[PDB]
């Protein structure tokens, strides 16, 4: 049994809700929240922008030190950093950004990072300002992630379309 409430169970391991990821993280304090990161961990907008704002920029400060030591992530890659006031840990995952021309086949590689964590609160990778089709992102998620994932959908309209169209 876990703390997650109000989620629509899609498969054995994937759940979905219309929820504010910051507000959901603040309520649950999950072991892992996933950030929709870029390779530079520059948390300017979308999921990263919102999560980082909710940490009062502490996520960005920590991320800048990570990059100064390690250099950029790979598209499809990830790193584990603090969850600050939102979670124990933040898994920063880089999905391909279609608005930069990145290979959408890297979306599966991005989701494979979730399998290193037994339970996660996450957004749909490469959705929103990363430019991918969120229906496609949900399909790759269900077909890739084997651990228990609780997906927070930012839009009520999009949430209803994802559920209604789910095979
Ligand atoms: C505050 C948020 N902005 C974008 C989200 C998303 O595309 O998942 S959540």
UniProtKB/Swiss-Prot annotation:
Notes on activation and inhibition: Inhibited in vitro by GRL-0617.
GN (gene name): rep
Residues of the full protein shown: 1025 to 1191 of 7096
Domain of life of the organism encoding this protein: Viruses
Role, per record: Responsible for the cleavages located at the N-terminus of the replicase polyprotein. Participates together with nsp4 in the assembly of virally-induced cytoplasmic double-membrane vesicles necessary for viral replication. Antagonizes innate immune induction of type I interferon by blocking the phosphorylation, dimerization and subsequent nuclear translocation of host IRF3. Also prevents host NF-kappa-B signaling. In addition, PL-PRO possesses a deubiquitinating/deISGylating activity and processes both 'Lys-48'- and 'Lys-63'-linked polyubiquitin chains from cellular substrates.
Domain Macro, first and last residues per copy: 1-167
Subunit structure: May form homohexamers. Interacts with N protein.
Source organism (scientific name): Severe acute respiratory syndrome coronavirus 2 (2019-nCoV)
Cellular localisation: Host endoplasmic reticulum membrane
Reaction equation(s) it catalyzes: Thiol-dependent hydrolysis of ester, thioester, amide, peptide and isopeptide bonds formed by the C-terminal Gly of ubiquitin (a 76-residue protein attached to proteins as an intracellular targeting signal)
Its membrane topology: Multi-pass membrane protein
Protein name per Swiss-Prot or TrEMBL: Papain-like protease nsp3
């Amino acid at each position: 049994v876990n703390s997650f409430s109000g989620y629509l169970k899609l498969t054995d391991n994937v759940y979905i809700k219309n929820a504010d990821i910051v507000e959901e993280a603040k309520k649950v304090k999950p072991t892992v929240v996933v950030n929709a990161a870029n390779v530079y961990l520059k948390h300017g907008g979308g999921v990263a922008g919102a999560l980082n704002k909710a940490t009062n920029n502490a996520m960005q400060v920590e991320s800048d030190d990570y990059i100064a030591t390690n250099g950029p992530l790979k598209v499809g890659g990830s790193c584990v950093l603090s969850g600050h006031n939102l979670a124990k840990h933040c898994l920063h995952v880089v999905g391909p950004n279609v608005n930069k021309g990145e290979d959408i086949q890297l979306l599966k590689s991005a989701y494979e990072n979730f399998n290193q964590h037994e339970v996660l609160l996450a957004p749909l990778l490469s959705a929103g300002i990363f430019g991918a089709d969120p229906i496609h992102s949900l399909r790759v998620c269900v077909d890739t992630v084997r651990t228990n994932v609780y997906l927070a959908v930012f839009d009520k309209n999009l949430y209803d379309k994802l559920v209604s169209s789910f095979l």
